[PDB]
mmCIF file of N, CA and C and ligand atoms in Angstrom:
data_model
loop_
_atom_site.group_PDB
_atom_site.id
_atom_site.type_symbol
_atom_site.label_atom_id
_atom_site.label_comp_id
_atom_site.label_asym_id
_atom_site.label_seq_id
_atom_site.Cartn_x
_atom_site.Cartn_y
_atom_site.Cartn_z
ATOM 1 N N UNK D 1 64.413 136.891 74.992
ATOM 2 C CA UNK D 1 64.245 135.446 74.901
ATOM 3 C C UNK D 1 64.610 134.784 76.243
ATOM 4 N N UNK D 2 64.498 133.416 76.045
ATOM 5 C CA UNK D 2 65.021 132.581 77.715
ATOM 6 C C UNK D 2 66.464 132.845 77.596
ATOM 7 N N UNK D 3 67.387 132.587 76.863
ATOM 8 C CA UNK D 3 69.036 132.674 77.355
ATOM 9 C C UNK D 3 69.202 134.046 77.436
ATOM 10 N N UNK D 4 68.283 134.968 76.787
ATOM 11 C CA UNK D 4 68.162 136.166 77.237
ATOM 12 C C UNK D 4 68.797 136.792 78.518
ATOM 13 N N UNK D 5 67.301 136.239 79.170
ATOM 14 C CA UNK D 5 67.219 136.359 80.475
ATOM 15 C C UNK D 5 67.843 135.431 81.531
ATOM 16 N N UNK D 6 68.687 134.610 81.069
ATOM 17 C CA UNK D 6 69.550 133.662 81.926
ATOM 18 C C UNK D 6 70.574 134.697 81.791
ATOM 19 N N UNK D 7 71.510 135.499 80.820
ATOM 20 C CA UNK D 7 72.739 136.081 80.985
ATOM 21 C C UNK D 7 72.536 137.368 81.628
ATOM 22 N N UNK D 8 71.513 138.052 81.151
ATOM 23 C CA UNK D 8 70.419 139.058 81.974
ATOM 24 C C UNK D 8 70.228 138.944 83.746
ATOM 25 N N UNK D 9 70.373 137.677 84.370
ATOM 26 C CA UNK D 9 70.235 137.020 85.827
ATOM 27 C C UNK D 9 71.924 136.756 86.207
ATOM 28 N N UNK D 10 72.661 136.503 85.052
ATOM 29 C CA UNK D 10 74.115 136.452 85.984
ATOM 30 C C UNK D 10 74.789 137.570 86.119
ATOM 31 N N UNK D 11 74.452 138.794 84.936
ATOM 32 C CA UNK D 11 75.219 139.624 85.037
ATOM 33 C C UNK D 11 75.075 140.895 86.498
ATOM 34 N N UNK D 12 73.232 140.259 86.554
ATOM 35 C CA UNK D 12 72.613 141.120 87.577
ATOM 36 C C UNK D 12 73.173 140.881 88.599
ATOM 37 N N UNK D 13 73.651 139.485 89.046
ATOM 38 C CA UNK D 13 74.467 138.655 90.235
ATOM 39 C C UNK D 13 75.758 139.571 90.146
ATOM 40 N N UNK D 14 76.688 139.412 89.475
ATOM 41 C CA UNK D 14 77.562 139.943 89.009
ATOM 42 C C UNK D 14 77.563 141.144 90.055
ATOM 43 N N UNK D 15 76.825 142.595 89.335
ATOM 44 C CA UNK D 15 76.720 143.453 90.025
ATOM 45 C C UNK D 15 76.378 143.438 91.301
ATOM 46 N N UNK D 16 75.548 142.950 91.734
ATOM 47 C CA UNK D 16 75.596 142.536 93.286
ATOM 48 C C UNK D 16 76.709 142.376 93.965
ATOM 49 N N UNK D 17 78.027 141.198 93.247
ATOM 50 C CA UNK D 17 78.484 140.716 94.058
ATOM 51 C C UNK D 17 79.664 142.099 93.974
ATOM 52 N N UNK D 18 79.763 142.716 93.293
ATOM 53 C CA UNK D 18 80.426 144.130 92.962
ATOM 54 C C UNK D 18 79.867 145.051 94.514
ATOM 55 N N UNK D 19 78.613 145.306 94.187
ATOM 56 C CA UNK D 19 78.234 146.105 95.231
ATOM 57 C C UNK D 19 78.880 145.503 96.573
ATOM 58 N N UNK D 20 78.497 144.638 96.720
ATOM 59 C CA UNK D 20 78.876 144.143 98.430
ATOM 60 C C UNK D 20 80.543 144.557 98.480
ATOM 61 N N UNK D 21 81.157 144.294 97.886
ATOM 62 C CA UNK D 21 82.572 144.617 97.636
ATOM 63 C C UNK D 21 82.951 146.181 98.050
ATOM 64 N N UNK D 22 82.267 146.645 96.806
ATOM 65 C CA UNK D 22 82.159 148.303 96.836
ATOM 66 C C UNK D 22 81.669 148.936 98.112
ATOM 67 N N UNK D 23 81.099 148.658 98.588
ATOM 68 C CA UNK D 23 80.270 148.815 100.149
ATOM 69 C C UNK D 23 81.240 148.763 101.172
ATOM 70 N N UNK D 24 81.506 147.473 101.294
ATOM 71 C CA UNK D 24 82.949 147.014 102.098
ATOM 72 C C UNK D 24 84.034 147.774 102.240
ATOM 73 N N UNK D 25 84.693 148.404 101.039
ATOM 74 C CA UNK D 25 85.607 149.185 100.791
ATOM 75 C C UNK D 25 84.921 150.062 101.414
ATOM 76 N N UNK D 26 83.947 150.899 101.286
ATOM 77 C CA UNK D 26 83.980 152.116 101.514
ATOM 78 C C UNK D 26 83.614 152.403 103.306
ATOM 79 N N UNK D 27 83.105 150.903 103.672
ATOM 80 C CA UNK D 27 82.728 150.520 105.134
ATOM 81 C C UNK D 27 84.063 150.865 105.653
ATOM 82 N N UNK D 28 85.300 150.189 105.184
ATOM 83 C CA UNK D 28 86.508 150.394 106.101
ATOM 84 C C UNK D 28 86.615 151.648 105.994
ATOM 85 N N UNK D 29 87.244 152.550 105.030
ATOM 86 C CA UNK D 29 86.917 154.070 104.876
ATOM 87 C C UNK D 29 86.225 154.974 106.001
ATOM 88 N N UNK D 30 84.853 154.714 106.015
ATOM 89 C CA UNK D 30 84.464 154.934 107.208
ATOM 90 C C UNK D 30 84.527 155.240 108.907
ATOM 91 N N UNK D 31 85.408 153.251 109.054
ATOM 92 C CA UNK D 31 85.449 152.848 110.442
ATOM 93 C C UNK D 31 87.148 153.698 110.970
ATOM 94 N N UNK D 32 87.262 153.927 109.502
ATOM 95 C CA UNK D 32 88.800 154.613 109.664
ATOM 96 C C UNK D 32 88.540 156.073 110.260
ATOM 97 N N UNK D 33 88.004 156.824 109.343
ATOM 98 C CA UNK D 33 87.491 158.028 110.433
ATOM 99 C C UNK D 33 86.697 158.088 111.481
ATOM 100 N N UNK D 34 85.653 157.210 112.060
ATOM 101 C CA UNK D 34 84.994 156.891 112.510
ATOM 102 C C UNK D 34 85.721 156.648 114.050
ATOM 103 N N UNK D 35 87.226 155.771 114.175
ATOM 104 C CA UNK D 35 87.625 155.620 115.274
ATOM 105 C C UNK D 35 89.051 156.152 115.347
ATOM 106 N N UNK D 36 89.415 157.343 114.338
ATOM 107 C CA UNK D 36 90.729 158.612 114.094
ATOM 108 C C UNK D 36 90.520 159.750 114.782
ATOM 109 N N UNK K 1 54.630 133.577 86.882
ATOM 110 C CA UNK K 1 54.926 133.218 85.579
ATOM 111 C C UNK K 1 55.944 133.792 84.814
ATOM 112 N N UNK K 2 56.221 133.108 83.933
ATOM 113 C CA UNK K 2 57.281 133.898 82.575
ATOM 114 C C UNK K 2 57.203 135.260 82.502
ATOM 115 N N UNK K 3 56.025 135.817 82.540
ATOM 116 C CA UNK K 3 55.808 137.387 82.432
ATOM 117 C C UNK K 3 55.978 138.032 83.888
ATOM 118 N N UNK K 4 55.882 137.025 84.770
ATOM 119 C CA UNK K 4 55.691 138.036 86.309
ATOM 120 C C UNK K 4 57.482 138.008 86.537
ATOM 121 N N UNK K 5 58.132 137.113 85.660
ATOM 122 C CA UNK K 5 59.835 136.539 86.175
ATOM 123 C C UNK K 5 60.354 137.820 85.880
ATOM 124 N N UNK K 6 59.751 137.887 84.282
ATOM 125 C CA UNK K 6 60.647 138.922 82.572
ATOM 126 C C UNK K 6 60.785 140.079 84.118
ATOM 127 N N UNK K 7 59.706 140.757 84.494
ATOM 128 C CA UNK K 7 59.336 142.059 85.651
ATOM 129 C C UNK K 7 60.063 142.444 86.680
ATOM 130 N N UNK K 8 59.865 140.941 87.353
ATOM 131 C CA UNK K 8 60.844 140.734 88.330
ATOM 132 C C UNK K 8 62.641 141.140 88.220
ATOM 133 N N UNK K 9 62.666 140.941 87.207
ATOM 134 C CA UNK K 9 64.200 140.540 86.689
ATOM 135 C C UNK K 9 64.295 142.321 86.361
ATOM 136 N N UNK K 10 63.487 142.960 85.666
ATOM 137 C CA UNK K 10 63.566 144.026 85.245
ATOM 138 C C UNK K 10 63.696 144.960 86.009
ATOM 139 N N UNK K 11 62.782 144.897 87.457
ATOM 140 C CA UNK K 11 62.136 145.631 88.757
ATOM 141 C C UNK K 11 63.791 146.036 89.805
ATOM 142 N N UNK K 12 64.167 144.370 89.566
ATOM 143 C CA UNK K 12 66.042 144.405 90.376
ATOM 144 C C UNK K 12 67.210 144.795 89.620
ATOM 145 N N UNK K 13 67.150 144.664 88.435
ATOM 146 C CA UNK K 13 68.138 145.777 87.333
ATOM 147 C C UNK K 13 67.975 147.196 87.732
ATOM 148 N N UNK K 14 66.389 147.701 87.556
ATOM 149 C CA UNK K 14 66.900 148.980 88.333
ATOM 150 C C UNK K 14 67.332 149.666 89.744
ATOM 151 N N UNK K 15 66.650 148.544 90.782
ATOM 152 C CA UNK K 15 67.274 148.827 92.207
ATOM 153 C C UNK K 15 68.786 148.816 92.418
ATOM 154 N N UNK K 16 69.885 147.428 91.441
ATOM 155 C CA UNK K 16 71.364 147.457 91.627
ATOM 156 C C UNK K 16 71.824 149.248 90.674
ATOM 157 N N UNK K 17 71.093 149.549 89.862
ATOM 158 C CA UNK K 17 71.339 150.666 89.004
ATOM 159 C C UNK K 17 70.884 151.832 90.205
ATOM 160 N N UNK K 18 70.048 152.062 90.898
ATOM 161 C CA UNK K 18 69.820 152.924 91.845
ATOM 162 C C UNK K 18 70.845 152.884 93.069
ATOM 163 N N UNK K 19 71.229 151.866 92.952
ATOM 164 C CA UNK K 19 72.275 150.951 94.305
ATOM 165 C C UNK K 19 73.927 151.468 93.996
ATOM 166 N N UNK K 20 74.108 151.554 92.575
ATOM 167 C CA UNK K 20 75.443 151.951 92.522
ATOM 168 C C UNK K 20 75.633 153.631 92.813
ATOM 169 N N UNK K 21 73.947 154.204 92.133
ATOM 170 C CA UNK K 21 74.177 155.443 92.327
ATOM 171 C C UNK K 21 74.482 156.229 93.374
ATOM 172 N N UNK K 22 73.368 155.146 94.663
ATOM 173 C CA UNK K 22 73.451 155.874 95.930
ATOM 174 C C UNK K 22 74.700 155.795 96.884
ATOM 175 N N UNK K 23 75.523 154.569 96.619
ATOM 176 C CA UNK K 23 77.038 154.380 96.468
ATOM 177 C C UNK K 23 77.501 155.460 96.390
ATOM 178 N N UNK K 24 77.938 155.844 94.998
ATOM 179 C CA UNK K 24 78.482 157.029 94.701
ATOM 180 C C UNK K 24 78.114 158.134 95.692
ATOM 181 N N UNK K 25 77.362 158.191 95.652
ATOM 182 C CA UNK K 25 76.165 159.983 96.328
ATOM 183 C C UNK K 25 77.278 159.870 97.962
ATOM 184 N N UNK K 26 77.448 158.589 98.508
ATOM 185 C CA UNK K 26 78.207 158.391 99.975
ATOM 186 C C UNK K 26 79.490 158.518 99.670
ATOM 187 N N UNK K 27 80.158 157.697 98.816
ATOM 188 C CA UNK K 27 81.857 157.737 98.517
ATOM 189 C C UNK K 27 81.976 159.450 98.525
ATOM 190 N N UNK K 28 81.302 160.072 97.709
ATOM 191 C CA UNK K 28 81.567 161.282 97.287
ATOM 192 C C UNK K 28 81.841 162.505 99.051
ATOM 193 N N UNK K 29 80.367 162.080 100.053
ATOM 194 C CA UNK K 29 80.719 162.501 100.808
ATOM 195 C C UNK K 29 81.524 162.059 102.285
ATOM 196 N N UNK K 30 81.633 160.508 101.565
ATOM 197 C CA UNK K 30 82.648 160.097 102.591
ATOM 198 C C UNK K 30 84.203 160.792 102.401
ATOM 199 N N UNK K 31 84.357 160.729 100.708
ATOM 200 C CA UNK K 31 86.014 161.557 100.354
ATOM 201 C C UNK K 31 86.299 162.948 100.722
ATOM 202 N N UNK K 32 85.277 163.613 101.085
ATOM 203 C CA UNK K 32 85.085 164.995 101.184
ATOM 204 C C UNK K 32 85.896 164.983 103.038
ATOM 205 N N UNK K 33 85.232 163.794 103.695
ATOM 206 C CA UNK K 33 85.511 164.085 105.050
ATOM 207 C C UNK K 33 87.053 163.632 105.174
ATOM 208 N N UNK K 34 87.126 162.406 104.542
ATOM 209 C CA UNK K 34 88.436 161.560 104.496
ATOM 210 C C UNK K 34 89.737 162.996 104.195
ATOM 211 N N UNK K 35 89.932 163.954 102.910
ATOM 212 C CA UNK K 35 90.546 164.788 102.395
ATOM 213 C C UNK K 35 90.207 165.919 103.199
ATOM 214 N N UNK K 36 89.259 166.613 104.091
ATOM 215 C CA UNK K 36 88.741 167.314 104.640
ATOM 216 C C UNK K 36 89.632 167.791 105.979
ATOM 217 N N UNK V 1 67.920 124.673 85.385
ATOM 218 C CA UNK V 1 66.480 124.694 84.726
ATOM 219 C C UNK V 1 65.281 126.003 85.230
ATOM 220 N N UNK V 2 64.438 126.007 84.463
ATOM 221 C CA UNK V 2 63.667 126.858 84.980
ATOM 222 C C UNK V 2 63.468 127.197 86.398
ATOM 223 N N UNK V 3 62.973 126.150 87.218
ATOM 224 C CA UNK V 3 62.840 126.044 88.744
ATOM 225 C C UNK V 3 64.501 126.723 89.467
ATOM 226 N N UNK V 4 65.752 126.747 88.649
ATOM 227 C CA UNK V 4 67.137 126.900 89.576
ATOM 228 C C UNK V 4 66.667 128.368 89.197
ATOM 229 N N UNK V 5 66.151 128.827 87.633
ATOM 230 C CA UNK V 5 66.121 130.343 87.560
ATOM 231 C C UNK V 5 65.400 131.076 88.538
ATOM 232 N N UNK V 6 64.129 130.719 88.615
ATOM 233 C CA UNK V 6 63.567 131.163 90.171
ATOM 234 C C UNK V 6 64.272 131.308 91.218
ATOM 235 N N UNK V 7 64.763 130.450 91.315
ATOM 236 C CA UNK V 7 65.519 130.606 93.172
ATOM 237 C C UNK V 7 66.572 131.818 93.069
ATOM 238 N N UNK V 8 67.314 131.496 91.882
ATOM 239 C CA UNK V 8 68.278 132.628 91.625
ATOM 240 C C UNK V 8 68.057 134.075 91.678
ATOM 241 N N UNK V 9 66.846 134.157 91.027
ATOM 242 C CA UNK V 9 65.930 135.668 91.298
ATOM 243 C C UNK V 9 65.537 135.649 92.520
ATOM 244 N N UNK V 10 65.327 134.887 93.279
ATOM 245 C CA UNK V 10 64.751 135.634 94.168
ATOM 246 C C UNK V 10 66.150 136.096 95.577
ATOM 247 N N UNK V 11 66.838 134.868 95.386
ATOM 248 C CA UNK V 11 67.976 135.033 96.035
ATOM 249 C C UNK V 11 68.585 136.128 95.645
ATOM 250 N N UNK V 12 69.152 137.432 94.340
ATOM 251 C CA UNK V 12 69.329 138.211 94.173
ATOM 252 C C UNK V 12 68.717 139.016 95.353
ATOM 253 N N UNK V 13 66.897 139.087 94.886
ATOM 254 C CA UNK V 13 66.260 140.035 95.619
ATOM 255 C C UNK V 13 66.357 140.506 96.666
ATOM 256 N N UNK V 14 67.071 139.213 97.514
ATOM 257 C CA UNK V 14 67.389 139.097 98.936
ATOM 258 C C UNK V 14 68.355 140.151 99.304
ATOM 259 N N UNK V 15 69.409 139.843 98.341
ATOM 260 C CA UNK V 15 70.908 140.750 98.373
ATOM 261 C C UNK V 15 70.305 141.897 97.932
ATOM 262 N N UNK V 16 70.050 142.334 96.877
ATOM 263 C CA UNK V 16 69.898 143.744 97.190
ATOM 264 C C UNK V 16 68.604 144.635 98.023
ATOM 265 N N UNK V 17 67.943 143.572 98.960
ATOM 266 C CA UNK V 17 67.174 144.152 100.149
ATOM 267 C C UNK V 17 68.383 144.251 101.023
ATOM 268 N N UNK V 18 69.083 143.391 101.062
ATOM 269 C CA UNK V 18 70.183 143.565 102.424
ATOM 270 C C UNK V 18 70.887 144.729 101.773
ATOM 271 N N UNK V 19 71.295 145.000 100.739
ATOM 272 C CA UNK V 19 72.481 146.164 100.283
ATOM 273 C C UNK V 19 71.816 147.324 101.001
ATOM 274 N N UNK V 20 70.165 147.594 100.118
ATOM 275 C CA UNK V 20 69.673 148.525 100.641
ATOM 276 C C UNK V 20 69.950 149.598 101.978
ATOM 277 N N UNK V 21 69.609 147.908 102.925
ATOM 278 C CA UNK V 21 69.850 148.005 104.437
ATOM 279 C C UNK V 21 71.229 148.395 105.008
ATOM 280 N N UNK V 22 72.239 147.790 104.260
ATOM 281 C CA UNK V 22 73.562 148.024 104.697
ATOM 282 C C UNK V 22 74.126 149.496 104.195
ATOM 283 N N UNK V 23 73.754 149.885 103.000
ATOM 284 C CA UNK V 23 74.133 150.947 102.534
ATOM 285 C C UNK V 23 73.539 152.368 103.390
ATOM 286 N N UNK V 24 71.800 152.128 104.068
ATOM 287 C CA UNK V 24 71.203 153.114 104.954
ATOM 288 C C UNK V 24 72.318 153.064 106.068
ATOM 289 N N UNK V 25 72.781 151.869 106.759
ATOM 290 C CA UNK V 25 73.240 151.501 107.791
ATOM 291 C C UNK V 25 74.647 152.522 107.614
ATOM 292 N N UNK V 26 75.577 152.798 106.523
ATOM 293 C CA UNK V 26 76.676 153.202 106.473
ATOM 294 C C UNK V 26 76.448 154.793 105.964
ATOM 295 N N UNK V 27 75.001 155.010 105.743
ATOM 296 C CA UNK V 27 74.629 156.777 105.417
ATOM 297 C C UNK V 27 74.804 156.838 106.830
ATOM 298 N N UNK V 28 73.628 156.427 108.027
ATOM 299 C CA UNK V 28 74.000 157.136 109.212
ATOM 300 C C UNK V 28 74.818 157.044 110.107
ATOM 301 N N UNK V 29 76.003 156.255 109.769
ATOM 302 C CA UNK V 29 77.644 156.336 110.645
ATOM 303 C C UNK V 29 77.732 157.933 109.717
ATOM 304 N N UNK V 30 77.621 157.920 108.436
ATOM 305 C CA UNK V 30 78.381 159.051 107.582
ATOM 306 C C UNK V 30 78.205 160.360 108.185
ATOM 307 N N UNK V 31 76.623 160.270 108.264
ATOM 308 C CA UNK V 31 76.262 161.476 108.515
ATOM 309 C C UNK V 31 76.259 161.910 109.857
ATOM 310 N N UNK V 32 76.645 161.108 110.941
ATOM 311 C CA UNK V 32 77.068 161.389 112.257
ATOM 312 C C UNK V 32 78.455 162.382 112.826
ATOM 313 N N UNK V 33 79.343 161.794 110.948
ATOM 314 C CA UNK V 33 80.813 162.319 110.935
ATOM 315 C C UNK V 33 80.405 163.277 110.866
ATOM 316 N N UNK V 34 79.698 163.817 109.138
ATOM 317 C CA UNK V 34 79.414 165.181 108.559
ATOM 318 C C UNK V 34 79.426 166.230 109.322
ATOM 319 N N UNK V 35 77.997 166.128 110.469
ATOM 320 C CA UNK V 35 77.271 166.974 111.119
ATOM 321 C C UNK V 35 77.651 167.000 112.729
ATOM 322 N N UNK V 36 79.389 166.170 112.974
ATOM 323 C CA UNK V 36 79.840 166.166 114.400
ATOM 324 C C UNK V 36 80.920 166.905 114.450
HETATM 325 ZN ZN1 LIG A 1 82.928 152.052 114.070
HETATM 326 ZN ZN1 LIG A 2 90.211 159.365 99.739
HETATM 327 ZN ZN1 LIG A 3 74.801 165.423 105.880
#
């Protein structure tokens, strides 16, 4: 249905804003061995 | 339209679902080097 | 309203084209470690 797909569009945001996070973390991780 | 949105919406559920996986697939061999 | 749901989708789309990009971007720091 439409509110369906409205909670369907935030939760998708949601995860996004997870990923960028998750990414980040694992970016420092990285820059840590990267310049060790 | 309504039907090209429903797709749309459907098309980026599975890219963040492919997105966490390929996440993982790196953490996994970033921890390997980090503990390594 | 309908018209904010649009923008919202597509603005997602955006983010996870950039994740995409950022996540390739942090395979080949990875794999520079791996294989150095
Ligand atoms: Zn660096
Ligand atoms: Zn670790
Ligand atoms: Zn490799």
């Amino acid at each position: 249905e439409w509110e369906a797909l409205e909670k369907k569009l935030a939760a998708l945001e949601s995860k996004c804003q997870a990923x960028e996070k998750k990414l980040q973390a694992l970016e420092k991780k990285l820059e840590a061995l990267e310049h060790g």
